[PDB]
Amino acid sequence: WNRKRISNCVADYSVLYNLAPFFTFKCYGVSPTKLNDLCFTNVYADSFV
């Protein structure tokens, strides 16, 4: 699986709602609606099928 480092950028997650007709969007530890209000040191995105 491919892991992509995401850093030094502004992440607005509402744009994701135009990217894909989501079947499952579930989060652990953070509510999905407050993700625009927080700051993270580094994000990692793992992509597979």
Add this chain to the structure above:
Amino acid sequence: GVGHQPYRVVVLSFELLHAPATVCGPKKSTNLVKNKCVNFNFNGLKGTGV
């Protein structure tokens, strides 16, 4: 896709029992018994007493 097919949504908002109740469930009332330790149910308020 699944995330863009339209949906039809009905929201049923209920007002709790703080007044005389106009909307009630399909239940049948019984006779009134006074001056005796009975189990009572007044508009969904359950209890046990005289």
